[PDB]
Write an enzyme that holds these catalytic residues in place. Structure first.
Site, PDB file in Angstrom:
ATOM      1  N   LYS B 206      79.287  21.525  33.086  1.00 44.79           N
ATOM      2  CA  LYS B 206      77.936  21.912  32.612  1.00 44.79           C
ATOM      3  C   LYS B 206      77.262  20.696  31.974  1.00 44.79           C
ATOM      4  O   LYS B 206      77.978  19.730  31.576  1.00 44.79           O
ATOM      5  CB  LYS B 206      77.994  22.890  31.431  1.00 44.79           C
ATOM      6  CG  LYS B 206      78.646  24.241  31.661  1.00 44.79           C
ATOM      7  CD  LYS B 206      78.724  25.086  30.400  1.00 44.79           C
ATOM      8  CE  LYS B 206      79.308  26.465  30.638  1.00 44.79           C
ATOM      9  NZ  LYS B 206      78.436  27.296  31.496  1.00 44.79           N
ATOM     10  N   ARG B 280      84.956  35.693  35.063  1.00 44.70           N
ATOM     11  CA  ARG B 280      85.269  36.834  35.961  1.00 44.70           C
ATOM     12  C   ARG B 280      86.687  36.646  36.531  1.00 44.70           C
ATOM     13  O   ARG B 280      87.311  37.671  36.883  1.00 44.70           O
ATOM     14  CB  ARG B 280      84.202  36.939  37.055  1.00 44.70           C
ATOM     15  CG  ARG B 280      84.273  35.835  38.100  1.00 44.70           C
ATOM     16  CD  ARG B 280      83.039  35.771  38.967  1.00 44.70           C
ATOM     17  NE  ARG B 280      81.898  35.351  38.165  1.00 44.70           N
ATOM     18  CZ  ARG B 280      80.642  35.275  38.585  1.00 44.70           C
ATOM     19  NH1 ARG B 280      80.324  35.610  39.819  1.00 44.70           N
ATOM     20  NH2 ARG B 280      79.701  34.868  37.752  1.00 44.70           N
TER      21      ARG B 280
HETATM   22 ZN    ZN Z   1      81.802  29.315  32.794  1.00 44.43          ZN
END
Ligand code: ZN
Ligand code: CA
Ligand code: CA
Ligand code: CA
Ligand code: CA
Ligand code: CL
Ligand code: CL
Ligand code: CL
Ligand code: CL
Ligand code: CL
Ligand code: ZN
Ligand code: ZN
Ligand code: ZN
Ligand code: ZN
Ligand code: ZN
Ligand code: ZN
Ligand code: ZN
Lengths: 426, 426, 426, 426
Positions: B206, B280
């Site tokens: 990120k 997830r």
């Molecule tokens: Zn993540």
């Protein structure tokens, strides 16, 4: 490889080269055409061109050569690739000594900063720094290397948190040049240097174009080391302590993370909101040690921000201080040593321009306060007890040239060594 | 720091402040001007402003104060920096009890999510969760921690694959609140929480602006933990199991890679095409364990997608379910507990919107199917055995405020604790 | 060219295709294998597959075909390239009339949105809308086209400021469907459509990947135009007004600029801080005209935000309203007409999530309020006199498929026409 | 509304607010607690906070209020939205006169820079400047406006090339304040201002986050205009000429392009390699005219580079000059007028740091010479005949605040007006 004669002349070049040419070549060799405007700058630029001709062996012949002219020529001729030999001209004892001290120490700064990170990790930087100062100080220098887990155990959470992501342990070098020999002699000056041997940016990873020269992120550490060594060759006869905060800023399963709060020994709590602003985190630990010694002078050097290069380019080092009289004294030293420094702002309000929602201090600025070099200087002020008095911060914007320019090859310049040395012995 | 009085009035402020002013200050202290449109909201907002004035010590004075108005004030007054002191008003035993339980458990959720990743790693998260429940459940709670290599030996490949890149091992907390102590007692509900103590994004790294708050990527695990603790204080007397999937998502020479195929214990094969879609992957392992307990309901909570924040901002938590009756009951609980939830779509077709060319499932959506929170919900449904009934998924879009707003300080809000607790005890 | 027969069967395909195949092919033609789960969906997907086989001429053969199944097949078969022929089966009068009305109006919506910007400028969009409605309304429709400087002179500062940058003049179409012909008849409903024939983003220029489909930024305008024409084929016998705010959002020496303040006829002042948030600026002018008619309801449609597609994909249209009973009636209409709608949040607090430092309203949101579709809907409410009742805003996230999918070719789908028509005639 | 009384006090507030509190409130009104450190700075911050409380009507009551404290309070209370009423305290005729001149002229600069580009184009900036000066000078001022094609015919190729892309013609305002009336009277000073009414960046387009405040790119023109008017109120009795280079930098089918070479009336050829470096191209034309008047002093001001803001933030204006004594006089004037300026480097080498492969000058620097504000200063030095003497360049980094800060609302500050006025009248 036969030598090329380099002569000095106050007469202009012939019409084929022009009355503006700084150098001309005939059969006898190369003539540098001086005009008196800035002969040292002209010589260093002519030397850069001469390296460009592929001339690997020169001889400075004829009259007019002094230590500064010889040094100006070498500063420009020297480049990180190939071997070069310069047959020096007959010189005065004092000038030959000054020149050898510049070649021994200022070139050590250029070579150490140019060394690849793989060759120069935190442990090598600390040892090479001890070796340089031990060669000129003899038994007047003692030191202590603290590293890895020992730094954490001792609370050096700034240096440890930044360097623990690497497989090469962070290192604190604490060196003591004590001439008088008196173990209780007052400390005159404390030098603190940023020794990041490789700065990937950490989790706040840099782009390749900005990271490809980050082997030079220890420039500050190398510059204060040379400044102490050169100051000794200049006759330094006062006690000075050297603090090197050395570490790699890498990415791993153990590297520090955004949001991490570092608690320092003076009680300061810093929220890390950019891992690439790691230099100020390691310098904080050095400034804490330098400030405890209560010396008459604290000088820190660091390749700390791109902001300083947006403000001064690579043409001047950034000077910061709340102490106008000490700043004036350093700019006077720079004038005497032919080195470029420009003062940038540092006021009380800069200590409030690193707001954080989770800690007293943030290590990074905001959109409302974009003067990166000034806010970083304000950040460091929080780690100097008497920050308004006797403390200078140098953001090393003149330390490295990513590409060759008119007077410099690519790589470290060594600028800053002489100015700090002049201030230590003035 | 002497206490500043805070009084409630149905009368408007004078013309100097303005007829529409929600608060005014006289000689006696601060007056909150209620109009009856949304008193709880007005007090929380007045409390935020009062924090902005620098008032660190307040006393709720006069008539009108109840548990909800006291909590609304503290919800807006509390901030992650500095120390604040509230002198509560004389309250009813039942109301003082309810308030004390909100201060102990909901602020535990705000403070635990606010804690830096360095302070709260996977093992510390699981241990603080045990401590919170043990404090209110006593001997009626038991648990099992499975960490590191044990997760791989036992086939928990989602949790192990995401967390193995960190030097801090992944941890599965399986906690059992069993009031009757009977081992065969039916499990009324299973709570599953995403406990990513820090999310760097992994190889799919990120940018800093999106990573600087990722210490809060375990807000799902804290929310369900607080929900269980708060439900016990509300009289929960049914068997509830808590599953916390705790892991750091980091980059190292051991971190999971794009193209890696994870085989779960239920036979699902998942191709990793984005390492930042890791929540997830770990939740999948907890949903497999939740389902095997054959509970009446499964409730999972996770700070899972940016999509839910684009759909609802930070003003509502996203609710996903195939079970209309159970989603209705959660929205009724939400209304009674004054918490904001909004239902987003989850249909059979979302189970096919994660195409992969190498495995049955991809962990990320595509351009054709950009409903990130709905496709994530579809992904999780492949790990709930009876996914069409008794299963609720909560994308915690209202769990964290990156910056202070009208009614909240920066950081975790604690929202969702009361709603899940109300649903578990209704 | 020869017709491939298409027949229906409630029996499965043979084992060579699999017992799960939705279609198979024998010597007699193609057979669609229905299972009762979602016949209309299976038929539309099969027709998309048949297009993929290169079959350009089909015959819907045998029994079981009705209007909906013929329409389902055509919806999936139609594509923007090549010419297709569908030999319909024998339908009763009502069935064929209903089918012919869908082909004439819903495919008009698909073809008009699909038309390139060069072919469909602001003036062409207004005239095509007039042609469509006059074709079914005869002398029950009258209209007014206001364009260019006349828009600025008459105070339509939103439509004019956005469109003045183009060499194709902005255009307002004000159409009045009045069956009774009585100029005093109460206006039952007002339809407002965003007709941006090409959106470059303006000085806030879009990237090529997001701009290459911006010929479809007039989808709202085409959808409300089709809804009115379809409503009339269903028996609309109440007065309805249509307002299309048509313009190109281009870059020129005359285009609107960041910081520009638009003053509307209702006193609202809007600071433009993103020229790509132009749709809400033109809709504001249509909504002021809709409110002035004092209608029983207002329905606006607009391809307004990327946020709506992040929240619902291209699988549902976003529905916004403060009116729960009216929103419920549109979701009931949507269920009866087989069209996908999902309600997203719209509350009083959204009206203040577009702060500006220079005007009452900003046209773009901030990081603290990233629910783009909800802030945009809250922006439009400042332009509806009784915004708390009888007003529905539709963010057309299901209007255009940038790439072919399981049931749709690339381009506009026509979704939304039937639902609005149903609500207008219910 | 009703006036809220604001009183000054050298006594700390009670312990409910804190000893460190700068303001406290009671039923009598708001009290500002002066400690003596920076009374004016503290009063400006308190006023900003008072605006935040939403108090639109205040009265400065009690003694202690002088023109500077009244002005400090107004500088922080003034904000671009809403209307504020301040009941001034009784003041000596001289104190009230000074205050009224600051209100009239400095707020003019704040309001004009804050005006949207749509409202303030090149011709409106030129005519509003004339109105301000002719309002305080009367028949002692004459002016000439040169516009559009006339600029190209007369050789103003810098100003004409940058502004021709706009539908609004570029405009040169040449204003002559001649108090003695003698036509041959020597010109004491020439003021030059960058009047870019909107900077889109041109073909080198800006991103929206950087272009949303570009209505303020004419701040330099407003600042020198305000300084002349203010100087006149301070008793300026010498001839001063004002040159405003006004233009919009837009994109169109007539806009200037990368590689275009602009020939200046002084013979300089400039290759445009970045259309966003357009301010230096229009200043060049005003500096040629300024130098042709052979004045004792030339002062230019421009919102020229982001580099100046990276060097000084919005906390100081950047001062560039080859004249150490003149730079020294501006800094003294800055200290007398309570305005913030900081000197950045400008040396002979900066004149060579804009290399071009097709012309004598480039309008942009390179990676080797990244001190954008110094290379911009170097560029401008090529348009000043006697550039080494009597010439000051101000990079207006303190002119505009994009977001509200401790002492300033969002928008123009009006800083710099008093400093230049003081220098002109010294
Ligand atoms: Zn993540
Ligand atoms: Ca190195
Ligand atoms: Ca945390
Ligand atoms: Ca179209
Ligand atoms: Ca302006
Ligand atoms: Cl010498
Ligand atoms: Cl561990
Ligand atoms: Cl309104
Ligand atoms: Cl006023
Ligand atoms: Cl020149
Ligand atoms: Zn760094
Ligand atoms: Zn660094
Ligand atoms: Zn995550
Ligand atoms: Zn747009
Ligand atoms: Zn649009
Ligand atoms: Zn520009
Ligand atoms: Zn500009």
């Amino acid at each position: 490889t036969e030598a090329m004669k380099i002569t000095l002349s106050t007469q202009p070049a012939d019409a084929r080269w022009g009355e503006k040419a700084t150098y001309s070549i005939n059969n006898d060799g190369i003539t540098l055409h001086l005009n008196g405007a800035d002969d040292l700058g002209l010589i260093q630029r002519a030397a850069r061109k001469i390296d460009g001709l592929g001339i690997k062996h020169v001889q400075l012949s004829g009259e007019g050569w002094d230590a500064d002219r010889c040094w100006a020529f070498w500063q420009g001729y020297k480049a990180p690739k190939g071997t070069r030999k310069v047959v020096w001209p007959d010189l005065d004892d004092a000038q030959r000594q000054e020149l050898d001290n510049r070649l021994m120490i200022i070139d050590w700064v250029r070579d150490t900063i140019n060394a690849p990170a793989e060759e120069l990790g935190p442990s090598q930087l600390a040892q090479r720094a001890v070796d340089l100062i031990s060669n000129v100080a003899g038994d007047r220098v003692t030191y202590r290397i603290t590293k890895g887990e020992d730094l954490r155990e001792q609370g050096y959470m700034g240096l440890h948190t930044v360097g623990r992501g690497s497989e090469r342990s962070p290192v604190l070098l604490a060196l003591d040049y004590n001439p008088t020999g008196d173990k209780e002699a007052p400390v005159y000056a404390c030098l603190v240097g940023k020794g990041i041997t490789f700065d990937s940016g950490g989790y706040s990873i840099k782009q390749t174009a900005f990271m490809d020269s980050m082997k030079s992120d220890m420039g500050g550490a190398a510059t204060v080391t040379g400044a102490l060594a050169f100051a000794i060759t200049r006759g330094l006869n006062k006690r000075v302590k050297l603090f090197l905060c050395c570490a790699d800023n890498l990415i791993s399963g153990n590297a520090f993370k955004l949001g991490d709060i570092i608690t320092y020994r003076n009680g300061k709590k810093v929220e890390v909101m950019n891992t690439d602003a790691e230099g100020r985190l390691v310098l904080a630990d050095g400034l804490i040690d330098a400030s405890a010694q209560k010396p008459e002078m604290i000088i820190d050097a660091a390749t700390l921000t791109g902001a300083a290069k947006t403000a001064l380019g690579n043409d001047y080092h950034a000077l910061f201080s709340f102490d106008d009289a000490l700043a004036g004294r350093l700019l006077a030293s720079a004038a005497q040593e032919n080195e470029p420094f420009w003062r940038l702002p540092l006021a009380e309000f800069h200590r409030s321009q690193l707001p954080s929602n989770f800690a007293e201090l943030n290590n990074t600025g905001s959109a409302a306060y974009p003067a990166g070099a000034s806010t970083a200087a304000g950040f460091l002020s929080h780690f100097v007890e008497n920050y308004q008095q006797g403390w200078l911060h140098i953001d090393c914007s003149a330390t490295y040239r990513k590409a060759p320019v008119e007077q410099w090859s690519a790589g470290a310049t060594g600028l800053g060594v002489r100015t700090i040395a002049n201030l230590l012995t003035a």
